Amino acid sequence: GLVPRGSHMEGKKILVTGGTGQVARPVAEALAERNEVWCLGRFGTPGVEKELNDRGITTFHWDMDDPGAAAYEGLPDDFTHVLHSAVRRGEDGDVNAAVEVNSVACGRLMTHCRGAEAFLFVSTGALYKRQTLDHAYTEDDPVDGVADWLPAYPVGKIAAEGAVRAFAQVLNLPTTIARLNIAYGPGGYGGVPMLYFKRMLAGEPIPVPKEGQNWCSLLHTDDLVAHVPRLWEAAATPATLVNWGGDEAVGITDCVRYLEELTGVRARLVPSEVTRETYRFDPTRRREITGPCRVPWREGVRRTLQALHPEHLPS
Numbered sequence: 001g002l003v004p005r006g007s008h009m010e011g012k013k014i015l016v017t018g019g020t021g022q023v024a025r026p027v028a029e030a031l032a033e034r035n036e037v038w039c040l041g042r043f044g045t046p047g048v049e050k051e052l053n054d055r056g057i058t059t060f061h062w063d064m065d066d067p068g069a070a071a072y073e074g075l076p077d078d079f080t081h082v083l084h085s086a087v088r089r090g091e092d093g094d095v096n097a098a099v100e101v102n103s104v105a106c107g108r109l110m111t112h113c114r115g116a117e118a119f120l121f122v123s124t125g126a127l128y129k130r131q132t133l134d135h136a137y138t139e140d141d142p143v144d145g146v147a148d149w150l151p152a153y154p155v156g157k158i159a160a161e162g163a164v165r166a167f168a169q170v171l172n173l174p175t176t177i178a179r180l181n182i183a184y185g186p187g188g189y190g191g192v193p194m195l196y197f198k199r200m201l202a203g204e205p206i207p208v209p210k211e212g213q214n215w216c217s218l219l220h221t222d223d224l225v226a227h228v229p230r231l232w233e234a235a236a237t238p239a240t241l242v243n244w245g246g247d248e249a250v251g252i253t254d255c256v257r258y259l260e261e262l263t264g265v266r267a268r269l270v271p272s273e274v275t276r277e278t279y280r281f282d283p284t285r286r287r288e289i290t291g292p293c294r295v296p297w298r299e300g301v302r303r304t305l306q307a308l309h310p311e312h313l314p315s
């Protein structure tokens, strides 16, 4: 029951992109104990590269905005496992840059790592065509590129998924495409739940629907980290597609109310026609691959608050 995080996988050589980010940093940190881990990125945030190096992570400058093959000189080709979590996604409305940069980076990275045992590409649930608020989306539900908040983002992921599927087959590189739901946890900035809390602190409106509430499938960092080795094991040619979320249906308003409950901070719920969109996933396929999640969301969110905003909790 008490098992160290680093024991999920040992003796491998792991390439991680997006290793500074919300999703992949805890993964790289967890695997760095018993594996050789390289993080590819830009490391523009002061001190993050030092923090990763201090854990025994080898860091390697890698910018997806560089279109050429020269960017890969000096990078080993004997990685056994790859986690591609970085996303080139800088608001400018430039859908062509988003499609081009992300798609080409997938191709160049998979080709470089064509000898790997498994390649894991992180995608998003935002590319599902909106059905009902409470619908539990499956891997076969219709897809569109609609996102009012960030239009180029889901379109770029559709294009990147296309590249990933094609290179998986051409290279015979076992691959998993994991469309991630909302990740959260005590590291980084805490995920969407803490973004809501920040708005509550600032007195900013939180749109909610006229009837009911929005729904998601929150995934805690500790569960996310446990899942990565199982997602690599499920990698295949053709690529394995899975909706990657938690085991609990989490109402967004329920989450906001819980933050109020914990802190005494009041949310300004605005019943509204137009709300920021979230998606709940049917966990059936993911559970077949990973087994059940372990962290219930109310305890996870409470401890995330304690880690990132301890002063706003009753003392």
Ligand SMILES: NC(=O)C1=CN([C@@H]2O[C@H](COP(=O)(O)OP(=O)(O)OC[C@H]3O[C@@H](n4cnc5c(N)ncnc54)[C@H](OP(=O)(O)O)[C@@H]3O)[C@@H](O)[C@H]2O)C=CC1
Pocket (backbone or CB within 6 Å): 017, 018, 019, 020, 021, 022, 023, 024, 040, 041, 042, 043, 044, 045, 062, 063, 064, 065, 084, 085, 086, 087, 088, 089, 122, 123, 124, 125, 180, 181, 182, 183, 184, 191, 192
């Ligand atoms: N809740 C969530 O977090 C969700 C995440 N996802 C997906 O999960 C993945 C990781 O997301 P998340 O951790 O939240 O992202 P973050 O915004 O936390 O981090 C983005 C990451 O992308 C890297 N990156 C961005 N631009 C470049 C570039 N030009 N060259 C190299 N690296 C770059 C950054 O590296 P550096 O700092 O070195 O620049 C950083 O590590 C993405 O594919 C995203 O679409 C999907 C749904 C929800």
Ligand SMILES: [Cl-]
Pocket (backbone or CB within 6 Å): 045, 046, 047, 048, 049, 050, 051
């Ligand atoms: Cl640094």
Ligand SMILES: [Cl-]
Pocket (backbone or CB within 6 Å): 088, 089, 090, 091, 092, 098, 150, 152, 153, 156
């Ligand atoms: Cl974008």
